[PDB]
Symmetry: D2
Subunit: 260 residues, 4 copies
Amino acid sequence: PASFMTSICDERGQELIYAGMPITEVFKEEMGIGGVLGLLWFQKRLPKYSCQFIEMCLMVTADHGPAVSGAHNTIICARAGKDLVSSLTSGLLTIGDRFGGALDAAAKMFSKAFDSGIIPMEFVNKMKKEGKLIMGIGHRVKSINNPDMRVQILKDYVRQHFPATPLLDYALEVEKITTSKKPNLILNVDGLIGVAFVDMLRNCGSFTREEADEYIDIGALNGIFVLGRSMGFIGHYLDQKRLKQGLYRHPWDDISYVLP
Amino acid sequence: PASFMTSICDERGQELIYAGMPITEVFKEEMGIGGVLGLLWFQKRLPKYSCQFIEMCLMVTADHGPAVSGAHNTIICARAGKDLVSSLTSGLLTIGDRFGGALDAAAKMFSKAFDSGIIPMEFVNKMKKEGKLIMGIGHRVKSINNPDMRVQILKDYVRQHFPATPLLDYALEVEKITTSKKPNLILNVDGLIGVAFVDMLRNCGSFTREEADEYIDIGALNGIFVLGRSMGFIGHYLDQKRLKQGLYRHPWDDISYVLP
Amino acid sequence: PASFMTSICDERGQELIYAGMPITEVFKEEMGIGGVLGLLWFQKRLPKYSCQFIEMCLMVTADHGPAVSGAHNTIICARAGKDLVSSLTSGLLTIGDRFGGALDAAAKMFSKAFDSGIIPMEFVNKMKKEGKLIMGIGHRVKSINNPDMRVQILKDYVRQHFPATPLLDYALEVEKITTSKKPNLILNVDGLIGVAFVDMLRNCGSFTREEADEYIDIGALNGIFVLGRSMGFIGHYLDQKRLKQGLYRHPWDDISYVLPE
Amino acid sequence: PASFMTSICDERGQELIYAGMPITEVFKEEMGIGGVLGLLWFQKRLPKYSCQFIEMCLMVTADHGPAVSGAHNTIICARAGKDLVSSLTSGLLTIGDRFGGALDAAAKMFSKAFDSGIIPMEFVNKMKKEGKLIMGIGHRVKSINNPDMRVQILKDYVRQHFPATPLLDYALEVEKITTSKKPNLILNVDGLIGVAFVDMLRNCGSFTREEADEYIDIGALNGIFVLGRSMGFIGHYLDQKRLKQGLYRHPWDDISYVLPEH
């Protein structure tokens, strides 16, 4: 009996196969990166609007500057003279909880609230009573009538092309309530990608509800952020090498030493 | 005085900027993933055929099955119950030398030969005399009589869209000479991506020769393989989680213990 | 205001300090690797038997061969021509759940049962009724009649030097109950290190119960396995380099390809 | 035919074996961590003074504060809410070149100079003429008449127990020359460990010269720094968790954004 099982790619034949589709057919059908992701991650031939949406998610998450945890760690690692893979990985390892984990957390929280049948106002008043933050809501500067253009771009695409967007509709009702009190409590990019990704899996027609719930549960949205942000982290590595930036050492004046 | 310097992304303003292009303009111009890569890695607005070529490279390198070093390690790590990032990274760390390093090695070797002015026959004779293998040449089963379809797809796109392909032309002449002696010494997918990527940087019009050479030197092609193959490794992680595969332990019958 | 806070090491003075102890005093007091770990991980000057016990844990977890997940991944990564750090890390990243996570899981499970006041027989019954495995119990070949020598070495040391071993005593009572039914349900090395490490934190006198519980909760035992097994993984890296082992590729005959139609 | 080969540890039998020594014998012989390292890394039963030296190396490299590249990255990773292994590894991945690479670089540079037969004065003038720094030399504050105490501890142990220290002797002659012009150009702890480790391998009696050279070449000294510093990095992870330190984001005022024009 075989010790390994695999479902995504077969390289043994005359031609490379991605989830049952020969590579020449992947190109003939113009599936793109989005469609290759649909085959390798989900073993589905996704509709073209789903492929393009996935590509849009990767584009909007590609980078968010050098100050965030992962980009900062990659930069330090490049400045210490390390190779591309080590530097990228040093940054990627910061991802999953407080940094880059909100896509997954927003998808789960909004799905749970929606599936439980609680209306948006009561979801908001419950989270306010329990003292818990709504994942995927809030921005430091952007506000209801000063939108995050990444959210706008995704939202226009999703609402036009998806057969339905019930979770996004629910999240937007939450946003109307939260922004009535504090204008900066908008549906942020992590919240938008999270809910729209659930809407894609649940309504594109390629998944049963059980499969959609499983892919969220095992971390498909963490995968999206990781693959997307890897573009920016490789870019930071290349940039630090070209800028001939030397070894970094954090300044002592920014560290409080509280030893016994 | 600032301790860090950065050139690729500015998130401080009203709108996210990738190398001077606001994110809304990235989408208006239909830049795609390849165009976002051009901005973040090279700080250039690349021509559309260059953007599509980059996307084709990522698609053909997305996965090559579960047996290769990195996929194997990712699978083991997923089967040990680890998270997506740890599992991906365990596989990525196998990349750069014997596994996934040939795109970079072929680009460098072919560029060095071409830039030195030596003709293809002279290059083959130089390597045969020095006992050194030509990187990007050779296949275990494909040959001049039985072509690799990923090579055919990439080669046809490049020859139909690029304004010039001198390094590819040079490598195809080397292939004619090597395959005349040993038919399995074809220009392989790593060799093709490597030389075609140099052709894109050198001839698309966005780079000086010094810039093109610098990007190859600091590891742009390692970046392409890593970003591309990350798609397949995330896919393997998700697959092992869905297949509910348990802890792996290598069989003792496949290990020779030669202790003192 | 400072953006970072740190408690373990001060390198700003002319002499390096580990948790309030100058490096010359660390050597003068013969604190060793175990005592340096006590300072850097716990900010305590631990008793000498605790320092030695920590060193014994690192020695028994140093390696368990090339077949386990992490050593295997390290070997593959070395055979792919990668550097020492990449190869080590590729293997370390397999640690924490099904591989190398049982020290932490056993410490937590036994501590929870002990702290709840349930007696060993009632803990075994509670787990059998809930269909949950007892972490740190069970071995493929070792038994009540064929002991695990790492367990024996650790247990012999602990009973000779620890002022009290209430959690190990509790775990050994659980072992008597499980081995009476099935001979192979022994207290294994992960179970032993896990409960003995809790006993050290709780009874050496350097920690309050709240501090001992916190160090277990934030992953001190994961740290022990990781630091210990890093010795073996670096050894595997060096070994593969000396053996001039070439690129590995898993055989197709050992893989079942179950792609869609 | 077997696809793998291994020399360091056999777990198949009744008792775990480290390079031919059963685990009960490892403890009965009081081998310690240094002796376990000698078995697993080198497949040798090293003399006790060599085992002790290895342990002293791990103790002196255990940590050097939170500001250095690797500790800083581990701290960031812990503050982002990640697990111990991810946080440790994020820091370890910074090691090998500009950070933590000087033990290996000093061992190789001093060995090459010594093996080539060039005298210490001529090695110093060559490096000045070529504009290359001597690896394992230099200290921000200690100097020839104000020694570094980690160097003093290790150097005394080495000279007191090793049967011969020709590379250390050569490095000390280099130090006398460098410090005659710039007092802080002392043999630092990376230089001391690097040359003393070569002296151990070459003179303890357990290795042939070919084996000693091979272990330096394949990265034994990188291994020492990595294993040693892992202790401090795990310590930083635990510390950040106890201090309940929140998500870090680097301040914009410390970053110069020089993007291409809009």
